Amino acid sequence: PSYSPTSPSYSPTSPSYSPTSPSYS
Amino acid sequence: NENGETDDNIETVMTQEQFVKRRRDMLEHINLAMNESSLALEFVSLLLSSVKESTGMSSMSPFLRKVVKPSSLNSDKIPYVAPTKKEYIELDILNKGWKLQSLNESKDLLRASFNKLSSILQNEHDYWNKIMQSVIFKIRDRTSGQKLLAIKYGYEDS
Amino acid sequence: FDFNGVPGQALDAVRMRLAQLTHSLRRIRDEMSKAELPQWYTLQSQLNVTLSQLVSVTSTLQHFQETLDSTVVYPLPKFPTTSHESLVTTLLRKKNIPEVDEWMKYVRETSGVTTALLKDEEIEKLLQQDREITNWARTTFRNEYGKHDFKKPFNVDDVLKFTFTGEK
Amino acid sequence: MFFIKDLSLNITLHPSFFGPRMKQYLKTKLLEEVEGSCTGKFGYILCVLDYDNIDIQRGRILPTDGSAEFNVKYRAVVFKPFKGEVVDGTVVSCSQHGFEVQVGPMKVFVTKHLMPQDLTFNAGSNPPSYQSSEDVITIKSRIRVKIEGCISQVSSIHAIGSIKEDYLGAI
Amino acid sequence: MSNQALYEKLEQTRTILSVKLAELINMTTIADRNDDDEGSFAQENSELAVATTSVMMVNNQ
Amino acid sequence: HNQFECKGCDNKIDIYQIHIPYAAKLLFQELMAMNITPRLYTDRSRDF
Amino acid sequence: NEVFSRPEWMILTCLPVPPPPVRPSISFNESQRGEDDLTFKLADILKANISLETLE
Amino acid sequence: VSTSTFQTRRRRLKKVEEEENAATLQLGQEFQLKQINHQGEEEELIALNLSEARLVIKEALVERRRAFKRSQKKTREKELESIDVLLEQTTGGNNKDLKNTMQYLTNFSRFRDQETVGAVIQLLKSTGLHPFEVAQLGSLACDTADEAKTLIPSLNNKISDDELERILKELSNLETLY
Amino acid sequence: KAIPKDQRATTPYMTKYERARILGTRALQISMNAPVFVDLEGETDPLRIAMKELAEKKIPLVIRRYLPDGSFEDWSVEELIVDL
Fold first, then answer.
1. How many A×C Cβ pairs under 8 Å?
2. Would you kindly state where each structural domain of chain H is located, as residue ranges?
């Protein structure tokens, strides 16, 4: 009962959270 | 003085591009934090485990379509110890003095432009002095009859 | 009985304050878009001032179970439905810092420290404590401010009676 | 307790009011009559809800007279106290007989005898108070009362109540 | 009347008194004041949120 | 004092007022004295 | 009818006594007073009653 | 002329039984569990905990002030002054009952914010408990499951001591820090 | 139960009794200082005022015409033909 429904926004296009360095064998 | 302080408190401005771009900045830079507080609402679905948890979960429409209660943890009270006891943690508390210092540097800067902002208000102190130097008809216009615009002055015929 | 009671003791408590900071931001975000008119500089400070307050309670709610939660450290296993559409899982379970971490460095490097170790560092701590003690001096000066305290001429009817009858 | 109740009141409007501000006067007269009102059947009719959607319906004609009669169907917040209801309230008056407690719209009175034996009347105080070994009950004190019974009295409902039983008394 | 108008001013003054003090005192806490003494009741633990106290202090105070 | 009561019914609430010729008030009191009940109701229950 | 007219109610056990409006009295001159025939008839009922009560 | 309800029952000649009103959950005919709204639909009794009530009235008087100005075109101690001002605007003023009610409500409400009253309302209406109890549980601050079961005697076997004591904990946690 | 306007079957004409009662009622109301819905072209008698209001069909009254079963048809004085 805080407000009513819960505000969507879900996002994978954001800045980024993952890096990358163990690509090499 | 009060009127002029109220003017600065009216957001008021006549800026083209200047005023325009700035407010767009507010939109995007505020929106970012709004959107990231929504990751905060996604930790809500992360509970699962309870009906009141589902309630919190439906917070995402994608939760509405990602049924699972999904996640689980174990015990690293040891890792809590490491967070607290690390030489790194002692050091990190230095990041506390460091950000706080630069915040105090900001604070100093803000504080000084404030007295100079009170100085443009001394132009007004002078205006009031000018008015002190040199009819008490009380009127209201712009209709409405209540609030709107209300002021006072004299006139001629009598 | 199959699977487990994993974690999330005060998780509900985080969610609540996670929401209120979401709820106060979200509403400001909705208005932020009607840049056609800004709500009254009173109104925005009422919403953006308790909207910042919301994050203080949400800031603290994090520390209160702060031993408990970094210790809990749950990484997700789920329905393989989570595995399709992928990323959402990378996204939704990920901790980082944004472009943010960078002015965190600007700030860290803004301090007077960095690689000189323990003995000289312990000393800086005692020195900062001395600054807080010189701040007590504020207590002394506050005492000086020394500002604390606490918060018919007659009968109308009878006059007339007289005028009419000479009753006095 | 404290209910939201759907109710309807018949109003008899004189022809002179058969102008466009008719609904406006009806909605007004409704509020004059119903709001504040205290009945036995419904208790205190405190506040009429949803002003903007008060259903006026079509007003019938009372034949020999000119006037139209409408059954104004509305919805409001009511307070109907009951025996057995445990309520919190502020002391208002206090005498050698007991003390009255204000519970929203109504006053609930506590008899010297409907309190524990330890609590005794102290006349020698400003204002007069009830004194226990530990407690002091006076004009401003907050008390939790158990309603023993109600009397539907005109434009009000009054009640007798105890603070003798467990978990009752001062707060 | 005049009284009610003044009351507000007095309250504002009290508010002005109580916040350069919070800027000073919170400065201590913002600078981080981790205590070897167990009795001391100010906290700055978690990363973001304990230096966030510094960002909030700025805007608030 | 605006008190109403019909003891025996214990009804201090469901009471109405009516305008009838006193001779009928009489007739009704008379029929009562003679053990007959001429119960007067302000609503209907039969239809038709 | 089980509510308004049970046959047990036909016989009289208790007697409703009508109020003065139904049987007015008049007080003329301290040695003249007029009572209604019903007030007479009632008094006989009563007297006859009080009598039979004492007998039983 | 006085107010009537949706309860149409035909009391033909047969006066009484008017069986006593107690918290054996035997409230009036009027305060029965199966009510009927103006749209004929059978709807359950609406009981308010004084806070849920405070908000309702405030909301209604707020919305009324709107229409009253529209038709005219052509910190608790702080809430008390704010409310006493709204009453001067919308209410008949002769209605002193609403004034005391609003003051009592402002001084005795356990939950300040609407959000707060939203969770209270959820947590409770899931127990299956009858609207009266559900209100008294929201409006009476209890610690022991015995405090609750003594004051709200109707509860007696309706809830586990532990289940009620679990609720009483998450109720205390919601109380707005006045 | 109330018969819909589209299903009304009583006379489209006003009965002698209806007209006598409307005139009686308006005159009574007019006499009890009710608002008059017509220009009184010097008129002072409330019945002559009533007659005038009915003459211009500016009487805001409705006839609830009861049928022996209990149902009814509502008719406006504006809509009733006054051939009397």
1. 27
2. 2-47, 48-72+75-178
